[PDB]
């Protein structure tokens, strides 16, 4: 009867994932600028959640170094766009309603519930852009944290 109250913070599985990407170094702003270019490499056909990969982020200068990813079974068409499968990883899961950007009490919430559990987090983490109002508009947002652990 509860859902989404809090930040539904769990333990998963997450079997490996084909994807579309494109590797991207830069401000977190320029990102938005690529993730179309893997949709139309791919005719537009996802088979699930597009996500960001995350290996370098610094949230005081909103620049990183990411895979822009869309789960496909398409091949690319136009080079940059390449596929390969996203890894298979246990994952502390937190769900996030509203605006994304930064997101700082989840990844506090996330680190607090790891040190509570005894669980060690291994980047990279991945944010999955389960849900939102689409094209034509925030509150409606949803974005699932996976971030890794130790097994
Ligand atoms: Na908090
Ligand atoms: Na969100």
Wanted: hydrophobic share 40%; with cysteine; charged share 20%.
């Amino acid at each position: 009867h509860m859902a989404s109250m809090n930040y539904e913070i769990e333990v998963k599985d997450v079997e490996p994932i084909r994807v579309a990407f494109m590797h991207y170094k830069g401000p977190a702003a320029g990102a938005s600028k690529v993730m179309p270019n893997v949709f139309k490499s791919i005719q537009g056909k996802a088979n699930g959640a597009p996500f960001i990969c995350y290996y370098v982020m610094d949230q005081q200068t909103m620049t990183g170094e990411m895979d822009l990813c869309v789960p496909t079974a398409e091949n690319p068409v136009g080079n940059g766009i390449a596929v390969k499968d996203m890894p298979r990883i246990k994952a502390i899961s937190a769900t996030h309603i509203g605006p994304y950007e930064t997101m700082q009490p989840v990844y506090e919430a996330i680190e607090s519930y790891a040190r509570e559990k005894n669980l060690i987090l291994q980047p990279p983490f991945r944010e999955v852009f389960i849900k939102g109002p689409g094209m034509i508009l925030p509150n409606k947002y949803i974005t699932e944290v996976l971030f890794p652990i130790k097994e």
